[PDB]
Amino acid sequence: SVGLIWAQSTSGVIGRDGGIPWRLPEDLAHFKRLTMGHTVVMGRRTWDSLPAAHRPLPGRRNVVVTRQTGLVAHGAQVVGSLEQALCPAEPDAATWVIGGAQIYALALPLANRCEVTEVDVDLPPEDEDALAPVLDQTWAGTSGEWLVSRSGLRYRMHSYRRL
Ligand SMILES: NC(=O)c1ccc[n+]([C@@H]2O[C@H](COP(=O)([O-])OP(=O)(O)OC[C@H]3O[C@@H](n4cnc5c(N)ncnc54)[C@H](OP(=O)(O)O)[C@@H]3O)[C@@H](O)[C@H]2O)c1
Ligand SMILES: Nc1nc(N)c2c(n1)CN(C(=O)COc1ccccc1N1CCC(C(=O)O)CC1)C2
What we know:
- The PDB classes it as oxidoreductase/oxidoreductase inhibitor.
- The entry lists the keywords sddc, inhibitor, Structural Genomics, Seattle Structural Genomics Center for Infectious Disease, oxidoreductase, OXIDOREDUCTASE-OXIDOREDUCTASE INHIBITOR complex.
- It forms a monomeric assembly.
- The protein is globular.
- It is 17% helix and 33% strand.
- The strands form two sheets. Strands 1, 3, 4, 5, 6, 7, 9, 10 and 11 form a nine-stranded mixed β-sheet that branches. The protein has a two-stranded antiparallel sheet with strand order 2-8.
- It has one domain.
- The protein has helices at residues 25-35, 44-49, 82-85, 101-107; strands at residues 2-9, 13-15, 39-43, 61-65, 77-79, 95-97, 113-120, 130-131, 139-143, 147-148, 154-162.
- The chain has four helices and eleven strands.
- Bound molecules: NADP nicotinamide-adenine-dinucleotide phosphate and the ligand Nc1nc(N)c2c(n1)CN(C(=O)COc1ccccc1N1CCC(C(=O)O)CC1)C2.
């Protein structure tokens, strides 16, 4: 059972300049509470984006997807494909794919659930932005209320499952 979790602007941006182009503390906490104790699978660029205090993500089995044989990621397991990341030698009840855009595109066909935070932030996309996957008619979801962060941004959480 594979889930994706991401935060996006309404416009669909998830990444810019090697990070996330908004600050939303309530969603960071939501991410931490949903993923704690589970396996988290990420692309190498997202692994490289994690700040030092969060690399590896504490309390989770970190799995990093790269084509670089010989890459060592201290505190994480390095695999050569997303299929490899989803065929662990020791199974986990819950596996969360935590980005980024390249890995989400690879994982979406294999996933049954998406947990999406929508951030009402005006972010005209730029050439090198990382963008969210698009959910087609094979996905249906439920939406929480629009909430306002202590920082001022409107946000809301969506929970999608494969039909
Ligand atoms: N808002 C959010 O929820 C969220 C979540 C996660 C990340 N982000 C942001 O998204 C950005 C990073 O995303 P990204 O799309 O640039 O990169 P990414 O998906 O995290 O990683 C891309 C890397 O994955 C590896 N890879 C891709 N396809 C592969 C395949 N088929 N087999 C093996 N390895 C494969 C490659 O590593 P090698 O080059 O090493 O071969 C590739 O360079 C950052 O700005 C980050 O902060 C945002
Ligand atoms: N895939 C996915 N989905 C989401 N909904 C969210 C995310 N990523 C990331 N989010 C944020 O708001 C932003 O995060 C961070 C941003 C900048 C620096 C550190 C962090 N974090 C510190 C604590 C770390 C941990 O210990 O987990 C995680 C990263 C929500």
